[PDB]
């Protein structure tokens, strides 16, 4: 796995991605890894924003499905056109698949003006691929093609250049210290878990639990927020602002509406609480907890062109669709996606960002009662 260490690649708020080859003879992208989605797609034509794309021409080993797919979030798109070939990973398993692949041929507000990506890999199940669940995922192709076993881990750092691993097929423990505490994973669509339990600085928010889960808790590399539903966000804030009184600032910033700023070394680290989200155990009764920093929530935007400060932006907002533990969260810890045993560990990362004052922390086992309560159906 050694092989695999540092293999990811990335700049801050424009996410992690791993070298990949499409194609015979090889074509190299740079390709997004996303838990929080199911396909893979690459570019396939001369939009200005990207470095490379697939040029479906050059390969011997293209077969076409003769199918569209139409793929949008909010405004919005991608546009493709399905097909298979043949993949493999560079610094990953010594292994090449035939995988499906969506060749976009149309998007809006998919790329990004200035990164170093031309792709997207969707590692979560076929449940949520579009357009439907009969199109295999990547990583159902490769278990299902080689003999890499049904698990992939992901260490990401972040420092501007970020950087991580991505183990495929295992876990690397110089990769996290101390032990891995594992969450099941409650269905096999998005990687999806349950928080049973949350404090700021070590107080409960006294919430039915069934909240935080409102409608789902997910596990995405895609997403640099920690995202929280609209109840659990609203009442979230009011203990971090309340946490936090020692300095004020304005509505907007806690809705990521304004940035905020400090001069360069002088961050308050203390007056922010932490985080602790409570996760279910493997065991009926059984929980435990993984606790964050404002360094993880507290990201340091690098240059606006109007400001020479330091200027971090608050990490966690809201949704309709649920809370989404991404980067903020990710990057604190050693994450094993252990598809095979349908649970997600997490352990204490051998590169999170720490001092001697507080640190990230993996520590159970607790006992909680009505765990299944904060499931929702
Ligand atoms: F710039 C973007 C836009 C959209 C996406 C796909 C999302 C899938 C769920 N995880 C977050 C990313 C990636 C990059």
């Known amino acids: 796995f050694v092989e695999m260490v540092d293999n990811l690649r990335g700049k801050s708020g424009q996410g992690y991605y791993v070298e990949m080859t499409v194609g015979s003879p090889p074509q190299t992208l740079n390709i997004l890894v996303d838990t929080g989605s199911s396909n893979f797609a690459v570019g396939a034509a001369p939009h200005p924003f990207l470095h490379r794309y697939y040029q479906r021409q050059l390969s ?31 610094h990953g398993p010594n ?36 357009p439907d669940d009969s199109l295999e995922p ?4 490769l278990v299902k093609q080689t003999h890499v076993p049904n698990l992939f881990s ?80 609203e009442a979230a804030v009011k203990s971090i602002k309340a946490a936090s009184s020692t300095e004020k600032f304005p509505d907007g910033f806690w809705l990521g509406e304004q940035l905020v700023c400090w001069q360069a070394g002088t961050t308050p680290w203390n007056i922010f ?47 309709s669709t649920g809370t989404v533990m991404g980067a903020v969260i990710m990057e604190g810890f050693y994450v094993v996606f252990d598809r095979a045993r349908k649970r997600i560990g997490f352990a204490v990362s051998a590169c999170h960002v720490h001092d001697e004052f507080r640190t990230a922390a993996v520590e159970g086992p607790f006992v909680t009662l009505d765990m299944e309560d904060c499931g929702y159906n």
Request: one cysteine or more.
């Open 154 to 233: 992901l260490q990401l750092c972040g420092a501007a250049s970020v950087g991580g691993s991505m183990i495929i097929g295992g876990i690397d423990h110089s990769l996290y210290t101390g032990s891995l505490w594992y969450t099941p994973i409650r269905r096999e669509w998005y990687y999806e878990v349950i928080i049973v339990r949350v404090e700021i600085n070590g107080q409960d928010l006294k919430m039915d639990c069934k909240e935080y889960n409102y409608d789902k808790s997910i596990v995405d590399s895609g997403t640099t927020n920690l995202r929280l539903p609209k109840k659990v966000f």
């Open 273 to 319: 609480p932490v985080i602790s989200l409570y996760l279910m155990g493997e065991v009926t009764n059984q929980s435990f907890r993984i606790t964050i920093l404002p360094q993880q929530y507290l990201r340091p935007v690098e240059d606006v062109a109007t400001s020479q400060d330091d200027c971090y932006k608050f990490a966690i907002s809201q949704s």
């Open 95 to 130: 292994v090449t698949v035939r995988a499906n692949i969506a060749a976009i041929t149309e998007s809006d507000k998919f790329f990004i003006n200035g990164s170093n990506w031309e792709g997207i890999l969707g590692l979560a199940y076929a449940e949520i691929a579009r």
């Open 60 to 90: 011997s080993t293209y077969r076409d499905l003769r199918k569209g797919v139409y793929v949008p979030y909010t405004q919005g798109k991608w546009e493709g056109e399905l097909g298979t070939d043949l993949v493999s990973i560079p």
């Open 138 to 141: 990547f990583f159902d192709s």
